[PDB]
Amino acid sequence: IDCGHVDSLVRPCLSYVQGGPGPSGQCCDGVKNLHNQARSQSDRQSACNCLKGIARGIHNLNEDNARSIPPKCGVNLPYTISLNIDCSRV
Numbered sequence: 001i002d003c004g005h006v007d008s009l010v011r012p013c014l015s016y017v018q019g020g021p022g023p024s025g026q027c028c029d030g031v032k033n034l035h036n037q038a039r040s041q042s043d044r045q046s047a048c049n050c051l052k053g054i055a056r057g058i059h060n061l062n063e064d065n066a067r068s069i070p071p072k073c074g075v076n077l078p079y080t081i082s083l084n085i086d087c088s089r090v
């Protein structure tokens with residue numbers, strides 16, 4: 001999957017991952033859309049690598065807030081996410 005596209009889907013989550021109120025509906029929709037598009041193993045792994053690279057470039061990233069996005073947005077994942085998630089097993 002294209003990192004530019006991934007970036008566009010989650011861009012609305014920025015304010016929240018930086019400590020602001022949220023997650024907004026636009027953030028959740030982007031995440032749901034990404035979840036709906038990254039289906040094959042390659043795409044999940046690709047999307048994972050992308051998000052980890054994007055997250056590492058955010059100043060004052062709040063990992064606690066970023067981690068709670070899936071559960072707060074209603075997207076159930078069989079695991080917890082973090083900056084050190086192994087993308088080869090997602």
Ligand SMILES: CCCCCCCCCCCCCC(=O)OC[C@@H](O)COP(=O)(O)OCC[N+](C)(C)C
Nearest residue numbers: 010011013014017031051054055057058059066069
């Ligand atoms: C399905 C699982 C979902 C996982 C949740 C993902 C959480 C992370 C989402 C973050 C999205 C926001 C990223 C972004 O779009 O960047 C916004 C930028 O303004 C951040 O700054 P940079 O890209 O580093 O730009 C450089 C800024 N400078 C020039 C001031 C240093």
Ligand SMILES: CCCCCCCCCCCCCC(=O)OC[C@@H](O)COP(=O)(O)OCC[N+](C)(C)C
Nearest residue numbers: 035038044047048051052055066067081082083090
């Ligand atoms: C929090 C700090 C920021 C770092 C950002 C890293 C987060 C990376 C998140 C990657 C998410 C991968 C994309 C995705 O949406 O996939 C979700 C799946 O892994 C979960 O769906 P399931 O079908 O339950 O997957 C289980 C495997 N199956 C398909 C064989 C059943």
